[PDB]
Amino acid sequence: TYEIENIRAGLEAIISQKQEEDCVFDVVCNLVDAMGEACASLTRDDAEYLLGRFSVLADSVLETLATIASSGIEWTAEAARDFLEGVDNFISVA
């Protein structure tokens, strides 16, 4: 395989299993682990390919990666959690 196929498989494996919590921080940590500093310029066309079946998530991933880039922490999964985790009404339907 190409390495972009292995990143894509690992993201579809996370998103297909994550339940009872929103997945964007766990997707962003897997990207920052696999690409490091190269996340700082990740384009929407590359992000949509890597997200595969779940390509709808791309805008929220890119908005999240800009907060890591602009807050001046280094590109590692340990620093990404340390920033993100420091930084509702719900009606039921018939």
Partner: protein
């Protein structure tokens, strides 16, 4: 009447002279084939940059005077490329890497190919072909040539007449042209040194034009192919066999149980391609609006020369995926290896591919040893694709290889490795490099090859029946909506789609799905969709009423519908790149061979080889086989062409006195004239077909097409609304932390929805029930495997699911075609080392410093959900085809053909192809708003 009859008398070609002080040298270089150290290059023929506005591409060429008082006329179009031969060092190269001319020379010899052999004369001195008084140091010189007399240009048999000069405006530049005439217009003779010859021009044509035509026939003797094409043009030899002696065969053909019949079929297919392809290329062609460079829309916002050059580089990046696909695909037209035998009877002979086969030794038509083969060679390792295979793809031409390398510089790397800067400062700078000596490490061809290494195809020695990949301009009438050519003529399916766009206009939605007013909130989002659903459901009723009152059998017409694409046969319709000349010519020669295979087989079954060699068998049979081909290849389901007679109206015409003009005196005469050829074969289109409906009849296939009905958990997020629920998320749920995917998946499992702080509860309970209701209705009814991105595609999906239900088509998904469309993006130059130029690189820290402030242009492809809107923009296309052949119905015994859309081979082609029966792909780049005005 016809375009041939209407064309005027004129010369066989022109020499153009452009002033160096004012001519736009950096613009033409972006469209050229220039390498570092060149003495000649090719550029496109274009009105307003290489020829004057109003240039006639069709002419009657005055080519022979049987005596001083009679002229003969040949009807011909121009050749597509212009050859730049005098002061050519003034045009910048397209690619900066050194050493290409020696690399091409070495690689041509190991494959056993013929190099250009110069005439024993010198090249014509400037004072022999320049107009009176012009300084040769002040001008750039180039040839424009007619398609029928280009071998005469190569062979030094044209005469230039400087006294007949004409002054012409080429864009801003005050330019001059001189006419060219065939030496057969001087029956008393002209001295051998009075004829026009340039050795750098003839060598450039040998490499960049004729070598690729020889590769398409599997011939090595390029100079002998040029000689037989010249005699075919001047002495009417189209019905005489001529290429068979030059043929060569591999051990898989020589060892074959049917080898004697295979050698005859392979030879006869090549003879027919050489008879018919030049005739169709020489024919009179329509003049496209894209041929006018000063009306190109892509320049419309540009101010000054830098903006114009940067606009041409963006234009070139939009074409690169077509060029890189023909390098990366295992089944590219550039890697066709020959003919082999099994498949049903008419499919039993077929075209093969493989670079391993192309390296092997060969035998001649008398079964004697011929070429001895090559054992192979770099950084991609043993048995794998090497830089020599890229040189073979480029026809051993440094001009073509330079423009291929320029397109490959737009491609992304895909690692299956040293960091880029430690490769560029490390092994790329070694004095062992046979190209740069380590003195240009960032732009070197070996550095580009190292970067793209894992995308090149495997090297193959097998004989399987696969589709081959073609590139070129599309025709006028494509049928690529969801039901293809269903009810195209008799209301028509085209009119039904026009009616739907009119209803969507009354809702405030345009043809690309843009709104005049975006939805304000939950009520407005529901209201927007319910109006589109009601508008589609109204049009289904009016259509079903029309089919009923006319008793039309629409329920059976759905079963036989096809998607249709037209591949254009006009050479002037192709994009303004010299690589597209070779891709078009080689696609045409390959299609004519593949169409001819069963025609040759049936004639040989009736007239057996009986141990004769193919040149002996063709001597008796070929004249009859030409006439069978003309009757059975055309209008039988792939190729369309129109025969016509060409006539000239006047018995004399106003022409210069060529005997006085040779002595420098200029005045007119009314010379008697007649046509030397009357018949013309005007080519039209090649037609590509794909079947829409699987009928369940072939029991082995059903598991790929079958429609499930059980209630899935993904039904909202893989349903018809998810892309809109994402696009409008910030207006539906102001300042929520939740992703749109998690909000609707939580609803899909827990039945709950968040209500914004001042918003009303029941308004959101309704939004949720709309999404749920339509998603379950779609899960039940849908047979079109698409998640729509815009309201026009959403509407068209709802419409076509209704028609298929009225036809009882409910058990299976339909076939889809998806367009892959180029998107151009600027990225940090860190892994794109060619931005540094011919610069010396001394350390990885200096490479990192020099790239830290720089950006590179790159290209990726995006999948469209709606091919039919791309086909309205008159696209450049690349696609795979197999030509299948079959018997007629109702007791008929004739052979009919279809060109069926196939699949790409090789994992390096595009990441969207990385894993189907029911989805196929085409690459498309639009031309409306780039080179043609809306």
């Amino acid at each position: 009447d016809n375009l041939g009859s209407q064309s005027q008398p004129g010369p066989c070609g022109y020499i153009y002279f452009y002033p160096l002080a004012t001519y736009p040298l950096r613009e033409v270089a972006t469209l050229g084939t220039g390498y570092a150290g060149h003495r000649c290059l090719t550029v496109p023929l274009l009105c307003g940059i290489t020829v004057e506005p109003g240039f006639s591409i069709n002419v009657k060429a005055l080519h022979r005077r049987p005596d001083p008082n009679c002229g003969l006329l040949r009807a011909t179009s121009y050749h597509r490329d212009i050859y730049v031969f005098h002061n050519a060092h003034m045009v910048p190269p397209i690619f900066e890497g050194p050493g290409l001319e020696a690399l091409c020379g070495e690689t041509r010899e190991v494959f056993g190919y013929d190099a250009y052999s110069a005439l024993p004369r010198e090249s014509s001195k400037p004072g022999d072909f320049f107009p009176e008084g012009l300084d040769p140091s002040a001008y750039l010189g180039a040839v424009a040539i007619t398609e029928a007399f280009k071998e005469r240009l190569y062979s030094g048999n044209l005469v230039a007449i400087p006294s007949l000069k004409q002054e012409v405006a080429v864009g801003q530049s005050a330019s001059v042209r001189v006419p060219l005439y065939d030496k057969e217009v001087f029956p008393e003779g002209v001295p051998q040194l009075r004829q026009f010859y340039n050795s750098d021009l003839s060598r450039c044509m040998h490499e960049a034009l004729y070598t690729g035509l020889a590769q398409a026939l599997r011939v090595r003797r390029v100079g002998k192919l040029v000689e037989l094409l010249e005699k075919q043009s001047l002495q009417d030899q189209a019905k005489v066999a001529k290429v068979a002696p030059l043929k060569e065969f591999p051990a898989s053909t020589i060892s074959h149980p049917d080898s004697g019949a295979l050698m005859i079929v392979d030879s006869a297919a090549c003879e027919l391609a050489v008879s018919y392809a030049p005739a169709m290329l020489e024919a009179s062609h329509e003049t496209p609006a894209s041929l006018n460079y000063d009306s190109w829309p892509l320049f419309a916002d540009c101010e000054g020369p830098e903006a114009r050059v940067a606009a041409l580089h963006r234009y070139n990046a939009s074409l690169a995926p077509h060029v890189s696909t023909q390098i990366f695909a295992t089944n590219s037209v550039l890697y066709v290896s020959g003919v082999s035998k099994s498949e049903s009877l008419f499919n039993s002979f077929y075209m093969t591919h493989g670079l391993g086969t192309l390296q092997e030794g060969t035998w001649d038509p008398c079964r004697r040893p011929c070429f001895s083969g090559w054992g192979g060679p770099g950084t991609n390792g043993p048995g794998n694709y090497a830089v020599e295979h890229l040189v073979y793809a480029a026809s051993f031409s440094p001009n073509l290889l330079a423009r291929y390398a320029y397109y490959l510089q737009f491609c992304q790397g895909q690692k299956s490795v040293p960091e880029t800067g430690s490769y560029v400062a490390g092994a790329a700078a070694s004095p062992m490099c046979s190209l740069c000596e380590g003195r240009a490490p960032a732009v070197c061809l070996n550095t580009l090859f190292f970067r793209l290494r894992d995308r090149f195809p495997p090297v193959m020695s097998t004989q399987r029946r696969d589709p081959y990949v073609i590139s070129g301009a599309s025709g006028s009438y494509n049928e690529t909506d969801f039901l293809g050519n269903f009810l195209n003529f008799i209301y028509t399916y085209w009119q039904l789609n026009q009616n739907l766009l009119e209803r969507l206009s009354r809702l405030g939605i345009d043809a690309e799905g843009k709104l005049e007013k975006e939805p304000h909130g939950p009520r407005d989002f529901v209201k927007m969709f319910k109006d589109v659903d009601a508008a589609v459901d109204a049009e289904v009723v009016q259509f079903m009423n029309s089919m009923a009152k006319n008793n039309i059998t629409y329920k059976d017409l759905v079963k036989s519908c096809y998607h249709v694409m037209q591949y254009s046969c006009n050479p002037f319709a192709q994009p303004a790149c010299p690589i597209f000349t070779q891709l078009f010519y080689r696609s045409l020669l390959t299609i004519l061979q593949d169409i001819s295979l069963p025609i040759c087989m049936c004639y040989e079954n009736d007239n057996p080889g009986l141990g004769q060699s193919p040149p002996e068998w063709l001597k008796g049979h070929y004249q009859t086989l030409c006439t069978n081909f003309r009757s059975l290849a055309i209008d039988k389901g792939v190729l369309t062409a129109k025969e016509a007679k060409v006539v000239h109206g006047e018995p004399t015409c106003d022409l210069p006195d060529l005997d006085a003009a040779l002595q420098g005196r200029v005045y007119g005469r009314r010379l008697p004239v007649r046509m030397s050829k009357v018949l013309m074969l005007c080519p039209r289109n090649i037609k590509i077909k794909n079947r829409v409906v699987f009928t369940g009849e072939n029991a082995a296939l059903q598991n790929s097409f079958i429609k499930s009905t059980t209630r899935r958990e993904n039904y909202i997020i893989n349903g018809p609304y998810m892309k809109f629920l994402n696009t409008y998320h910030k207006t539906l749920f102001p300042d929520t932390k939740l992703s749109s995917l998690y909000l609707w998946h939580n609803f899909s499992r827990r039945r709950s929805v968040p209500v914004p702080s001042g918003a009303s509860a029941e308004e959101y309970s309704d939004l949720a029930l709309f999404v749920d209701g339509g998603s379950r209705a779609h899960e039940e009814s849908n047979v079109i495997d698409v998640v729509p991105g815009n309201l026009v595609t959403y509407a068209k999906q709802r419409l076509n699911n209704a028609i298929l239900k009225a036809c009882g088509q409910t058990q299976f998904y339909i076939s889809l075609i998806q367009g892959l469309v180029p998107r151009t993006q600027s990225v940090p130059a860190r892994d794109y080392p060619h931005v540094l130029g011919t610069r010396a690189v001394e350390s990885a820290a200096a490479y990192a410093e020099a790239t830290s402030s720089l950006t590179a242009t790159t290209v990726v492809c995006a999948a469209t959900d709606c091919l039919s809107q791309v086909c309205k923009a008159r696209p450049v296309v690349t696609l795979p085809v197999t030509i299948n052949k079959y018997t007629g119905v109702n007791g008929n015994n004739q052979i009919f053909q279809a060109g069926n859309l196939g699949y790409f081979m090789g994992r390096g082609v595009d990441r969207n192809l990385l894993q189907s029966m029911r989805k196929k792909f085409v690459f498309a780049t639009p031309t409306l708003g780039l080179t043609v005005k809306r």
